[PDB]
Amino acid sequence: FQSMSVKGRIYSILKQIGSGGSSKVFQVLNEKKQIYAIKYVNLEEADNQTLDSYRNEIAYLNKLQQHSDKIIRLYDYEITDQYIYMVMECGNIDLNGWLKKKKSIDPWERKSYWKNMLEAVHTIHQHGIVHSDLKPANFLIVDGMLKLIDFGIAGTVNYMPPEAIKDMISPKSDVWSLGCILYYMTYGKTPFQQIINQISKLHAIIDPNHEIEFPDIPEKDLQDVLKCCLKRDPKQRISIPELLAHPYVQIQ
Numbered sequence: 001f002q003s004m005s006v007k008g009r010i011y012s013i014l015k016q017i018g019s020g021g022s023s024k025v026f027q028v029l030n031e032k033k034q035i036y037a038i039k040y041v042n043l044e045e046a047d048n049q050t051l052d053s054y055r056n057e058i059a060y061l062n063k064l065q066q067h068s069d070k071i072i073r074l075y076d077y078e079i080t081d082q083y084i085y086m087v088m089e090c091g092n093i094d095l096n097g098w099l100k101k102k103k104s105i106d107p108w109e110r111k112s113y114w115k116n117m118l119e120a121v122h123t124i125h126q127h128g129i130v131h132s133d134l135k136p137a138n139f140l141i142v143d144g145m146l147k148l149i150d151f152g153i154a155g156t157v158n159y160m161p162p163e164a165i166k167d168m169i170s171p172k173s174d175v176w177s178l179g180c181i182l183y184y185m186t187y188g189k190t191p192f193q194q195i196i197n198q199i200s201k202l203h204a205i206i207d208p209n210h211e212i213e214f215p216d217i218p219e220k221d222l223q224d225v226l227k228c229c230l231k232r233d234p235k236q237r238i239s240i241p242e243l244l245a246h247p248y249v250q251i252q
């Protein structure tokens with residue numbers, strides 16, 4: 001029931017959505033009784049390298065507002081040397097939680113969600129940003145529409161591209177990750193969710209002789225997309241602009 005001020009405007013805290021390191025996301029009500037999400041960040045113990053990553057992701061979230069509606073709306077913000085307050089639109093639940101709750105996944109729902117993720121990840125790519133770490137928790141359902149919460153600028157290994165393991169990279173990295181999200185939305189498991197051991201799992205994603213199973217499904221376009229996304233060589237892997245012109249996304 002605590003009330004906070006962001007650029008003069010008063011917000012009434014309804015519940016706490018989540019809490020990062022020195023971060024806290026709340027569900028709030030404004031003076032017009034409209035519902036929003038306020039992210040509070042504590043800069044007390046935050047270093048100069050940390051502050052720039054925060055400033056950069058805010059500016060990117062700010063610029064990409066205009067270019068796409070698949071990026072979470074940033075209404076207002078207040079930045080001081082002590083804290084950050086970001087006033088964003090409120091979603092229902094994140095894709096990671098929603099997929100964990102829903103036993104059955106509708107082909108239309110899946111297709112519509114796939115379309116959204118491609119548009120969001122395409123937008124960040126256009127501006128030169130590659131997330132490099134995509135998991136369903138990065139997406140949020142806002143009125144039956146998937147939206148991108150972060151840009152990997154400011155954690156499960158199942159969605160990692162072989163190139164991220166080989167750096168022990170490029171816009172094609174994000175394609176691999178999106179491929180695993182759709183694979184979970186198609187089969188109900190991640191390509192390597194079978195492997196409990198993390199080092200045996202990492203050895204499998206990097207290995208080409210370890211064949212990923214693509215069971216026969218009533219959706220042949222969905223098979224081709226999954227087969228196209230999950231190619232270990234990023235040069236051989238399908239691009240986002242091509243994925244957007246794919247029959248799976250385009251045909252009724």
Ligand SMILES: CN(C)C(=O)c1ccc(Nc2cc3c(cn2)cc(-c2cnn(C)c2)n3C(=O)OC(C)(C)C)c(Cl)c1
Pocket residue numbers: 017018019025027037039061072088089090091092093094097137140149150
């Ligand atoms: C605990 N979970 C999974 C929930 O039930 C849940 C998850 C998400 C919810 N909505 C929601 C979450 C939201 C936002 C707007 N709405 C904005 C943000 C946000 C935070 N940083 N940035 C750059 C955007 N956000 C957010 O980060 O939510 C999580 C903490 C759950 C990931 C709500 Cl209302 C509930």
